[PDB]
Amino acid sequence: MVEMIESQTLLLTYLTIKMQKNLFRLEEKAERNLLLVNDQKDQLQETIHMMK
Amino acid sequence: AEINQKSLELELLRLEKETADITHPLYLGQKHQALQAMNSHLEAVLREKRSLRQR
């Protein structure tokens, strides 16, 4: 019984570490994409204001 | 964006203040009145030219 629980713990832990590593990579790519688009928004906003 | 809006407003108000003496209805109205008083006076003087000449 102790050997079975340990095997379960190993599976869960493996899944967890694998997911966390791949999630951090997505979050970083996402934030970068948002900042790039936000910067484009900011340039357009300044040009519109000057024209007005 | 908010700074830009307020900055424009300020610029507009400043332009209006600087040109008010020649452009605002209030100041222009006062000048009209002074001119009408003198007109009337001159009309009167011209109407009594003979009497004034005799005097």
Swiss-Prot record, chain A:
What does this protein's UniProt record list under function?
Answer: Contributes to mitotic spindle assembly, maintenance of centrosome integrity and completion of cytokinesis as part of the HAUS augmin-like complex.
The cellular location(s) given in this protein's UniProt record come to: Cytoplasm; Cytoplasm, Cytoskeleton, Microtubule organizing center, Centrosome; Cytoplasm, Cytoskeleton, Spindle; Cytoplasm, Cytoskeleton, Spindle pole
Q: How does it assemble?
A: Component of the HAUS augmin-like complex. The complex interacts with the gamma-tubulin ring complex and this interaction is required for spindle assembly. Associates with microtubules. The interaction with microtubules is strong during mitosis, while it is weak or absent during interphase. It is unclear whether this interaction is direct or indirect.
Q: Which chain positions lie within coiled-coil regions?
A: 25-52
Instruction: Please report which protein family the annotation says this sequence is part of.
Output: Belongs to the HAUS8 family.
User: What is the name listed in the Swiss-Prot or TrEMBL entry for this protein?
Assistant: HAUS augmin-like complex subunit 8
